[PDB]
Amino acid sequence: SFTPLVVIELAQDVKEETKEWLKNRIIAKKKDGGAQLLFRPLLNKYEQETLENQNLYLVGASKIRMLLGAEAVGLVKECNDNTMRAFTYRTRQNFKGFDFLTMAECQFIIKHELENLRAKDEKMIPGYPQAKLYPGKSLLRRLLTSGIVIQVFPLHDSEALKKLEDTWYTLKYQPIDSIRGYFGETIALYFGFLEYFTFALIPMAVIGLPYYLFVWEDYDKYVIFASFNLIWSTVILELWKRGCANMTYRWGTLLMKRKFEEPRPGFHGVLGINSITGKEEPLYPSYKRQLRIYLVSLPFVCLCLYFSLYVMMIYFDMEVWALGLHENWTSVLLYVPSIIYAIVIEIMNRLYRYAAEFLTSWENHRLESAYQNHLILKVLVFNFLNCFASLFYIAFVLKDMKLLRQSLATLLITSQILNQIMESFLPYWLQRKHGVRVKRKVQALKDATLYEQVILEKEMGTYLGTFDDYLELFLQFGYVSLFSCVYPLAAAFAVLNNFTEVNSDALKMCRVFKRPFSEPSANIGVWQLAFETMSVISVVTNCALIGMSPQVNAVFPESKADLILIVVAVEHALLALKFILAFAIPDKPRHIQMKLARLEFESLEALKQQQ
Amino acid sequence: FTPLVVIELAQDVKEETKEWLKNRIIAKKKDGGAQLLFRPLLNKYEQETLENQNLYLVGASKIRMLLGAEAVGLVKECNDNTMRAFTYRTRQNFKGFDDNNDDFLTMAECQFIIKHELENLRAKDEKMIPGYPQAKLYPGKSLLRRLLTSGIVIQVFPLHDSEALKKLEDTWYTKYQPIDSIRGYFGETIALYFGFLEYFTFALIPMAVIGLPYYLFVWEDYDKYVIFASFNLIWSTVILELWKRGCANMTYRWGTLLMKRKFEEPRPGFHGVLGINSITGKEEPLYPSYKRQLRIYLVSLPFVCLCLYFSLYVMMIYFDMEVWALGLHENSGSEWTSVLLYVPSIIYAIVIEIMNRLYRYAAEFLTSWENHRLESAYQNHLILKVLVFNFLNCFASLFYIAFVLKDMKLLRQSLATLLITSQILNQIMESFLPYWLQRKHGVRVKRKVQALKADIDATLYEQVILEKEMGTYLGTFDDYLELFLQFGYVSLFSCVYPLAAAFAVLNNFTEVNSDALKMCRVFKRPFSEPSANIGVWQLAFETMSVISVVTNCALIGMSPQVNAVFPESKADLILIVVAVEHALLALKFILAFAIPDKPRHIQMKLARLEFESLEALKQQQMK
Ligand SMILES: [Ca+2]
Ligand SMILES: [Ca+2]
Ligand SMILES: [Ca+2]
Ligand SMILES: [Ca+2]
Ligand SMILES: [Ca+2]
Ligand SMILES: [Ca+2]
């Protein structure tokens, strides 16, 4: 038998008609339609005498098949002449690494082939007339939608994971290239950004430290810190682009033209010939998708954003009712509105995410990258508003810096400690307990090594995505760039949390969730726009907070109109300089730009020779 | 052969130099030098012909022209309706091609290829220009550049096709502009201007119609001003975004959009140590980017800032001169005083012209000294330098009257002079007067040829003598600047001067015919440049639409109608205005981001070609 890489779990009582049909499509050659992979059940006929196979099936492929699949996805690898080119089976000897493809790459290729399994003449899933099919429809999608296939997931490499673990937690630089090799470009990019952002916050943590310790509340002192803050915000987000470009080029994912990739299983449409790639795949009119975006999805997001402000106002009206009652058991009643609002926020965030996931799926995006960018953008604007609208209200409407400091202190200390317990420490404790339980059950049987590994990973938690992880750092960047003049220790507590966040998130990836399917990402996606918008908002925030300070208002006792005009002029000058600085700093280093240019030139010379 | 390009040499150039120049223009590319055809204007001279002896005609073979078309990378439509770069080996696959036919490449394309080959004529072992030891040479140095710098070669220019120009003329002046016909004769750059001119005139029409009842019925209300300014800010973004889409359609059809101009050979003005290019692998001059960057930010940038400060200093003298003139009219009491009021405006306008001609010489010098590799880079940097100076001299006085003096009566009168009197005088100076003078020279040349009485046909002789002494078209800058300043008065001060767009459309209705006469019967044929966009002008026009948000919000916030609502709380009023301004600037950027710069069908056509290039690279590395 083969090396098992991907597991497919089928429902409770799936018909044999369906099982054999699914087996045929996963085994049959691509010429006859269907992936040319290998299919086998978790347990053999001999071991099925005791341990019955609970409709769990293992998927693998040939060494030649894997290399042909690597060409299909367009994996870029380094050649002997140190140039990065897309892999081809005919040109396999020219590649430097040629153990060539990692397990993560192998499992991604298998996932890609299973996702591109499309219905030919089948009018339904055999045995299930309710689960109707049409030419071009993704089989894996229809199987998951109907509920015939419960889940498809890649298997962990216990020995490889343990080797990475020892080089990961502990003191030195994070092994981003090792994380890439096991989890993929997307997960390694997150741990690469986390390590970078922690180092990026260090200057702001060191500069902000004497502002708290010696209580520096002067005009000159605040202007110096805010000026440094605005320069820091631009320079770190610009230097990240350059650093990411170096890393993704080395990986080869930067040279990948992801726009020509095959559509996601969730993409529906009339089967036809693609105008660009020439592939027989589903076709959906862009205007239908655009109308759903701007006429249904956009007004819904705006309604939820308005409702968020409406709910926030109820909390600030509830804090008035609670303060009046305390002024007239009362000390307990003061905590009550903060407890209620925080609970309502959690109810709102879980409900909006279901509505956002539905609408982005309904929008019908062709590529997974597009679906992700649109889904992140929807959930992010809602999560940002619910988190910062109350903070902005205290700072600029209430103008209560004592309450704002206490609000930020809860968010940066108590909330981050509780977050780490809920995020990885508690789920790890619970997963470790399940791990012993399963291990003991297998010992009592009297070779179920792979059986135990599949049963364990099957019931393990599914990693939802890098969104929740990046959002933590986005909100961190929010408190630091916006209110560092109010709370100078903002960056100090951000670095302290991030010092344990690397260890906690690693533990969450290794011993909590089952292996997530690798995605060849070339950047942090729509997060770059999000972080850059936050650095633009920080100009407005820092200029307002300085203009609001009683030190500046002492200079302008009557002429308050003049003061605002000066502040607005300074704000406009800073916003212009911020854009010039971002334009002046190239998003890619010189050597990467030249390497990308020579490859661009080669493609044009190749097209002239081929025609 | 058929003469296409003319090379004029200085009055007494040595035969050593003439034969050497002839050799480099005729010798095969393998031995170094363009594989073109060289011949003198006349083989038979007379007394009146002996003067015009150093005139030489340049042409090329049909095969040579096609090989030269491949070298520049001209993109033409294939039989499968796809746009691909020309190759002599793949010549049969291109639509409209026939070996016996010479109608494939236009005269404008042909003359561009010849110019390109003459510009890429580089010195091999020559340590100087033969016969002129002062005009030193080194390996890699452009011969055409050194010949023009030393003064051995006076000028190099393409010849007009009289019959073709007359056919275009009848379809041009008088319906929609024949942009594809202008492209065929003058090139992508000149046709792009007339394409933008025609578009901008149509784009201004809504603003001219909306602004018309604001003047006629004198609509000076809060609601009325907000509606117009809101429409103005939406209009500014949408027209500049729709232009990008329209330009993309046109440049794709032309093929210039599919051209990768970044890999093109350097301009003749580019100097450096001869070496191998890291990207193209071509043996061309090499210059370190850091040296160019230091010259830009440490010498050129502070100079531009000094001239910009001096412009504000000179402007202040004018606003101090208008005070001296207002006092001399008012303290005295006669008629002679009414004449003295016009005097400072006349002096300042003259000083501005002296400043603009002097700064342009300094800007042309510094951009050449910066040492840019591509002609596109030299143009974008030169446009940007001259534009910030021309914009400041034109608008600093307008901004001073509007926000320092806060005199809307004076601002209206200032814009009225700029949009009516100044635009009428501009058209006379731009084409009407130079055409009158060129027509007079035309009669003088025709009479000179009639007096010859030679045993040869002096049709080509007359054509060369005429076009040689004709004015040289400096570039599309002055032409685009007119429309940029127009867009400036319209997008910024439409709330103050509602007829701004009305007079802009009226001038542009004659500008099309005035600039057509200018390009046909005033200047000699300009060398075609395959442009794929309006260049740095897109950034300039977009910055103007960003400034218009600040301007319209300030002018509305300043109006006594809004200040009537806020009698004491002036701080609150500014906070509302600034909040509205920030919201509009955000929405303006979102709207520009939402509108795709290229249409769906062009994006797909560009995508399939991008995919084909990757599939080609995979097949070539396999080969
Ligand atoms: Ca955490
Ligand atoms: Ca996390
Ligand atoms: Ca940048
Ligand atoms: Ca004019
Ligand atoms: Ca003009
Ligand atoms: Ca756009």
Author numbering:
A (entry chain A): 14 to 111, 117 to 188, 192 to 349, 354 to 471, 475 to 639
B (entry chain B): 15 to 188, 193 to 641
Question: What's the publication's text?
Answer:
TMEM16K is a widely distributed, but relatively unstudied member of the TMEM16 family. Here we show that TMEM16K is an ER-resident lipid scramblase with non-specific ion channel activity and a dependence on calcium ions and short chain lipids for optimum activity. We present structures of TMEM16K solved by both X-ray crystallography and cryo-electron microscopy, revealing a classic scramblase fold, with extensive conformational changes propagated from the cytoplasmic to the ER face of the membrane, which lead to opening or closing of the lipid transporting groove. The TM domain of TMEM16K is C-terminal to the cytoplasmic domain and has ten TM α helices with TM3 to TM7 forming the lipid scramblase ‘groove’ and TM6 to TM8 forming the binding site for two Ca2+ ions, seen in other TMEM16s.
To understand the structural basis of lipid scrambling in TMEM16K, we initially solved its structure by X-ray crystallography. We obtained preliminary diffraction data from vapour diffusion (VD) crystals of full-length human TMEM16K, which we improved by lipidic cubic phase (LCP) crystallisation to obtain 3.4 Å resolution data. Both structures were solved by molecular replacement (Methods section). The structures were similar (monomer all atom root mean square deviation (r.m.s.d.) = 0.75 Å), although the crystal packing differs, confirming that the conformation is not dictated by crystal contacts. All the protein samples used in cryo-EM were purified in the detergent undecyl maltoside (UDM) with cholesteryl hemisuccinate (CHS) added to improve protein stability: the same lipid detergent combination that was used for the VD crystallisation. A fourth Ca2+ ion site on the ER side of the membrane at the dimer interface was seen only in the LCP crystallisation, not in the VD or other structures, so this site is likely to be the result of the crystallisation conditions, not a characteristic of the protein or this conformation.
